[PDB]
């Protein structure tokens, strides 16, 4: 039987390898926050402290 | 022996005294790749 199951195994291995790579590489975050340039040098840290 | 109607064909397709393959090469190739 091993004669004919080459392509299935070859595709299975690649599909699982991609899953492993994505699990290892994808950033783990849920919020993306952006702000303008007019906030102060110390006034900015207060925002992240409040969110934190 | 002369009563066989098959003499119609083998005088045309298969000349007497010449051996000819049972199957064509394309069939053999098709069979070979089937197992894989």
From TrEMBL, chain A:
UniProt-recorded name of the protein: Portal protein
Organism field: Agrobacterium phage 7-7-1
Lineage: Viruses, Duplodnaviria, Heunggongvirae, Uroviricota, Caudoviricetes
């Amino acid at each position: 039987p091993l004669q004919a199951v080459g392509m299935p195994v070859a595709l299975y291995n690649g599909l699982m390898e991609r899953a492993l790579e994505q699990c290892d590489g994808t950033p783990n975050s849920k919020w993306f926050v952006t702000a303008g340039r007019d906030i102060g040098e110390v006034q900015s840290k207060e925002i992240k402290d409040g969110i934190d | 022996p002369s009563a066989n109607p098959a003499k119609i064909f083998i005088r045309r397709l298969f000349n007497s005294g010449i051996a000819k393959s049972v199957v064509s090469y394309s069939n053999v190739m098709a069979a070979a790749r089937a197992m894989e």
